[PDB]
């Protein structure tokens, strides 16, 4: 089964909009997920749908780009850094759950060097 998806909200939770998280969406996010790659990143991985029952029992700090961008549109950071920390979550737990030379992991390399590219361009 499937656990919830992480929060893309909470009430108690400090918030703030800051000129890097703004490019962190229009720019970062935005980009990232018109990428031939980006596909298998932009909503939560449904181990219901993919036969994956060991998922998250590998897995124990899931992240995704879906989830990353409802973050960024409820400012639900504090700071660009907090974001930047789910992204290399996302391909982190990519690089977990799956081996060196696969195709998942081929996509995960190409995306964040390109993640890496636009971080360099951070205002
Ligand atoms: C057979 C296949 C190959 C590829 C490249 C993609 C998909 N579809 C999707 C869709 C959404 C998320 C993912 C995903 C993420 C993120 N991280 N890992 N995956 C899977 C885990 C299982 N898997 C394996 N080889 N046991 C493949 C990679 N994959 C299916």
Same mark, same amino acid.
């Not at 909200?9 to 997920?33: A, E």
């Not at 879906?66 to 504090?78: D, M, Q, V």
């Given at each position: 089964?499937?656990?919830? !998806? !992480? /929060?893309?909200?909470? &009430?108690? =939770?400090? $918030?703030?909009?800051?000129? %890097?998280? %703004?490019?962190?969406?229009?720019? *970062?996010? $935005?980009?990232?997920?018109?990428?031939?790659?980006?596909? !298998?990143?932009?909503?939560? *991985?449904?181990? *219901? =749908?993919?036969?994956? &029952?060991?998922?998250? $029992?590998? @897995?124990?700090? &899931?992240?995704?780009?879906?989830?990353?961008? =409802?973050?960024? /549109?409820?400012?639900?950071?504090?700071?660009?850094?907090?974001? @930047? %920390?789910?992204?290399?979550?996302?391909?982190?737990?990519?690089?977990?759950?799956? $081996?060196?030379?696969?195709? @998942?992991?081929?996509?995960? /390399?190409?995306?964040?060097?390109?993640?890496? %590219? =636009?971080?360099? /361009?951070? &205002?």
């Amino acid at each position: 089964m499937n656990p919830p !998806p !992480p /929060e893309t909200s909470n &009430p108690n =939770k400090p $918030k703030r909009q800051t000129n %890097q998280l %703004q490019y962190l969406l229009r720019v *970062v996010l $935005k980009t990232l997920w018109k990428h031939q790659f980006a596909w !298998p990143f932009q909503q939560p *991985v449904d181990a *219901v =749908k993919l036969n994956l &029952p060991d998922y998250y $029992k590998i @897995i124990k700090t &899931p992240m995704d780009m879906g989830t990353i961008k =409802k973050r960024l /549109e409820n400012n639900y950071y504090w700071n660009a850094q907090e974001c @930047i %920390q789910d992204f290399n979550t996302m391909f982190t737990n990519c690089y977990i759950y799956n $081996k060196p030379g696969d195709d @998942i992991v081929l996509m995960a /390399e190409a995306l964040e060097k390109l993640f890496l %590219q =636009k971080i360099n /361009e951070l &205002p």
